[PDB]
Design a protein around this ligand. Structure first.
Ligand SMILES: Nc1nc2c(ncn2[C@H]2C[C@H](O)[C@@H](COP(=O)(O)OP(=O)(O)OP(=O)(O)O)O2)c(=O)[nH]1
Ligand SMILES: [Ca+2]
Length: 596
RNA sequence: CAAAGAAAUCCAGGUGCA
DNA sequence: GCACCTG
DNA sequence: TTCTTTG
């Protein structure tokens, strides 16, 4: 039933001085060296694997190659993603049992069991504790990526921010007997920070909060102009605009923090009575006026707009922005396009000065985050025709929409994928089931929308490009799962791989084909299932070719068994885009190596 | 002083999947 | 329930 | 880098 070992540090344990009789005495040496290792702690940087080599004697491992099996697991811990696991059997399979000196008295029957127990003891009582002793795992919020930060460096960063917040009077200490609603967490955010409350899990008032949220959204639906969907707005705008489109995307700085609580309170109190009780109005006003958080053994009032991480802040920020929109961003020209997602505005017009006027208007009403502004206005510093907005890239010149992929340089793309689920575990002899979950649709489904696959404003050229890019992601997930099979399942025979990949190619082409038919428009010429299959195969080939030694036989079947010919039925499509990794995808890191 | 342990990743909405 | 996305 | 709780 229990197949997985979690890589996360939370599973660590307090080590004893010695082990009991049924554990072998060899661990006492590592325990002794472990305590001695901490007495030598230096601010100077440390390499964990080097430290373990001073802690765990070679004689524990027997052969130096048996040591490598264990340390490969540690290296995975040092480079883990959120939720990542390994198979427990990795801790005892294929070890050289004849060469482990402290097992030579145990019967051949009982050896693997004992090695699992001692390896687990080392990992849970020495390895993970020594990592946690030196480092703090920071969840970076780019996929499931984790970065390990020296504790001194993390505390120093956190103390800078906390001092700012007190100095600005955003955080004000109250008496320690005031009850807080959660714990303040300062998360690193690309050289900046995100102050959130981690809300205390209170399941008693969750139904009440859902009720209040539903009430606020009914106020919004009933009393405020409901914007068309982003897709409908772009479709109608591109259809009626004949010239060059000009446009701007802007982002509000510190959006929740700059909600003016006195204005929001007045707004809530003016909601009509049939839409919100007097008690519920008073409850919300009291709720957002008295925000109390715990931090480092003290209790603070939060006095900077709405607390990020409180469940009610979401619908209340929307209420505030809808009000701002009614006051300031309504009755705009019929010519123009506008759409707002939370604090992000996308404004376009065929008239450049109207885009300029909108920028001036938005900058008078809000404080803008100027690092996030994107525009093709010629007067601006670095104009560009591709505007990122709501996870898509809108090309103002060609009117084409492409999926936005967030892949910084030297980003390990495996951090995007959740290959292991501790609640739904898969046996080490069921590699097929592991791959089946890895190739399921939902993780990539946001690249399979009407934005990518319509032929209303998108040409076939960009429909095919969107599909190829999505299948590049799928192929990278397949590769990441394959790495997991060989290092954790220890799969020897890979016969079934050809079929899963064939079924996966066909399932994804079939999903794209249906979306293309559903969202067909005037730019549709001819899209064939066969052309989509060929594109999907070429995406896999482009990714598999990054490890041609491992995938040589697989690459060779693809080329000898599958038709890779692409009848685009559109002379504007460029075939060479489908013969190589797109540039955004060409530089992602695919080899994991510990740095700490 | 020594050791041990702790220093808390949350929320709304969306796509959907099956 | 799952696993992605937006802010 | 702090805070408890125990040698
Ligand atoms: N609880 C929570 N709220 C979030 C998260 N991401 C965004 N929000 C909410 C609160 C932010 O104020 C608002 C705008 O999102 P941003 O990502 O633009 O952050 P912010 O505007 O706070 O700061 P900025 O100056 O743009 O870096 O959306 C999140 O991960 N957790
Ligand atoms: Ca913002």
């Amino acid at each position: 039933m229990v197949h997985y070992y979690r890589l996360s540090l939370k599973s660590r344990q307090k080590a004893p001085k010695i082990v009991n009789s049924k554990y072998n005495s060899i661990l006492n040496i590592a325990l002794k060296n472990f305590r001695l290792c901490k007495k030598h702690k230096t601010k100077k940087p440390v390499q964990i694997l080097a430290l373990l080599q001073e802690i765990i004697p070679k004689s524990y491992f027997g052969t130096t190659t048996n040591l490598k099996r264990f340390y490969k697991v540690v290296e995975k811990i040092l480079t883990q993603s959120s939720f990542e696991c390994i198979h427990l059997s990795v801790l005892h399979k294929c070890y050289d049992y004849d060469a482990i000196p402290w097992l030579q008295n145990v019967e051949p029957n009982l050896r693997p069991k004992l090695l699992l127990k001692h390896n687990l003891f080392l990992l849970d009582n020495i390895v993970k504790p020594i990592i946690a002793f030196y480092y703090k795992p920071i969840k970076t919020l780019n996929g499931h990526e984790i970065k390990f930060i020296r504790k001194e460096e993390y505390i120093s960063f956190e103390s800078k921010v906390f001092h700012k917040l007190k100095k600005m009077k955003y955080l004000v200490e109250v008496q320690d007997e005031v009850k807080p609603r959660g714990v303040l967490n300062i998360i690193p955010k690309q050289d900046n920070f995100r102050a959130i409350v981690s809300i205390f899990p209170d399941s008693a008032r969750k139904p009440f909060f859902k009720l209040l949220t539903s009430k606020i959204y009914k106020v919004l639906e009933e009393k405020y102009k409901t914007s068309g969907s982003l897709y409908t707005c772009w479709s109608e705008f591109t259809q009626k605009t004949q010239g060059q489109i000009y446009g701007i995307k802007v982002d509000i700085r510190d959006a929740y923090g700059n909600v003016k609580i006195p204005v929001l309170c007045k707004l809530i109190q003016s909601i009509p009575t049939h839409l919100l009780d007097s008690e519920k109005k008073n409850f919300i006003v009291d709720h957002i006026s008295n925000q109390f958080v715990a931090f480092r053994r003290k209790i603070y009032k939060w006095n900077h707009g709405l607390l990020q991480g409180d469940p009610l802040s979401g619908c209340l920020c929307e209420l505030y922005m809808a009000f701002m929109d009614r006051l300031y961003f309504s009755n705009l020209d019929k010519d123009a396009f506008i759409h707002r997602t939370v604090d992000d505005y996308f404004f376009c017009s065929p008239h450049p000065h109207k885009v300029y006027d909108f920028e001036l208007l938005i900058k008078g009403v809000y404080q803008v985050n100027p690092t996030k502004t994107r525009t093709n206005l010629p007067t601006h510093r670095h104009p560009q025709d591709e505007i990122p907005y709501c996870g898509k890239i809108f090309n103002l010149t060609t009117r084409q929409v492409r999926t936005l992929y967030k892949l910084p340089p030297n980003y390990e793309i495996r951090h995007k994928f959740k290959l292991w689920n501790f609640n739904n575990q898969i046996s080490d002899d069921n590699p097929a089931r592991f791959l089946q979950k890895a190739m399921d649709f939902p993780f990539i489904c946001n690249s399979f929308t009407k934005f990518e696959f319509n032929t209303v404003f998108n040409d076939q050229r960009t429909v095919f490009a969107n599909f190829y890019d999505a299948m590049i992601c799928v192929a990278y997930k397949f590769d990441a799962a394959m790495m997991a099979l060989r290092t954790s399942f220890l799969v020897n025979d890979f016969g079934f791989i050809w079929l899963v990949l064939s079924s996966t190619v066909r399932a994804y082409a079939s999903r794209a084909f249906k979306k293309i038919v559903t969202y067909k428009g005037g730019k549709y010429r001819k899209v064939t299932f066969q052309c989509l299959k060929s594109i999907a195969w070429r995406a896999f080939l482009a990714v598999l070719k990054r490890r041609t030694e491992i995938y040589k036989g697989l690459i060779d079947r693809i080329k000898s068994r599958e038709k890779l010919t692409m009848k685009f039925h559109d002379g504007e499509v460029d075939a060479s885009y489908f013969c190589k990794l797109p540039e955004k995808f060409r530089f992602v890191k695919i080899n994991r190596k510990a740095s700490i």
